[PDB]
Amino acid sequence: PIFLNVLEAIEPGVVCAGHDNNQPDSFAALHSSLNELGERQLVHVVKWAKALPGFRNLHVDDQMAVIQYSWMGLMVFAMGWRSFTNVNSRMLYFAPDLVFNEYRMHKSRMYSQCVRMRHLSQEFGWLQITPQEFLCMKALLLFSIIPVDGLKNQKFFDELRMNYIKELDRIIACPTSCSRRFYQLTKLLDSVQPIARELYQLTFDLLIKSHMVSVDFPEMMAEIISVQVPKILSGKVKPIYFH
Numbered sequence: 001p002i003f004l005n006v007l008e009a010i011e012p013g014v015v016c017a018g019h020d021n022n023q024p025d026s027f028a029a030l031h032s033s034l035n036e037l038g039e040r041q042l043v044h045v046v047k048w049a050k051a052l053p054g055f056r057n058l059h060v061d062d063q064m065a066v067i068q069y070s071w072m073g074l075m076v077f078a079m080g081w082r083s084f085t086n087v088n089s090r091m092l093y094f095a096p097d098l099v100f101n102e103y104r105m106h107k108s109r110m111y112s113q114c115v116r117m118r119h120l121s122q123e124f125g126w127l128q129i130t131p132q133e134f135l136c137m138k139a140l141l142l143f144s145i146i147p148v149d150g151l152k153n154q155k156f157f158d159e160l161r162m163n164y165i166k167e168l169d170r171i172i173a174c175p176t177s178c179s180r181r182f183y184q185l186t187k188l189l190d191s192v193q194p195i196a197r198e199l200y201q202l203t204f205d206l207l208i209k210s211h212m213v214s215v216d217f218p219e220m221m222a223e224i225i226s227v228q229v230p231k232i233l234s235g236k237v238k239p240i241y242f243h
């Protein structure tokens, strides 16, 4: 099982937000820690992506682009899995030191987005997603958003995406049950993109608002949210849907 061996081997370990849980649950303090968590996870997403089978076949500029468009969906999908396995879905397990209860969902001013993230987390239980299915679906999310004008070497991207779809098929197969499962998992994958889109809109709006009041985001987050996220929000970069 070479493919699943690799995915299991490179899966990132635990990452803490660095949140001081004895300060009060203010909008400012919670988003400060969420943004730091994202900056810390970005490091792990890059190292994970560069170690995926075939990823280095992509042109170097495409490698960075695909990471810089897919990170929100990757991170939300992983957080949903952590929540499913750690608190069983009525809380959101962003990190061991940053677990959202209903009060923090409200004070962060992200309550509706957290509701949707809780729903995604609960789908891992409703569908009885296996660790192998989770790992292959998460890898596919890296190959599920691209510029409408294409990548520098789109042909290699298309072949790589094809092969990750084949791997998902293989895990399901390892025929009427297979077909239903594949439909369920591809419907689950598609449901990540609208959630990520909402969070992309939110974080852009907050970066603008924070800049107005002279509070800076972490370095890599501020660059990606001002250079790459607006390409998503303006329609120059679009998700690839199955259905």
Ligand SMILES: C[C@]12CCC(=O)C[C@@H]1CC[C@@H]1[C@@H]2CC[C@]2(C)[C@@H](O)CC[C@@H]12
Binding pocket: 031, 034, 035, 037, 038, 041, 072, 075, 076, 079, 093, 094, 095, 199, 202, 203, 206
């Ligand atoms: C990806 C993160 C941080 C990592 C994670 O577990 C998922 C979570 C989803 C909400 C994101 C957050 C990073 C910081 C963001 C983007 C805030 O600016 C607004 C929404 C937050």
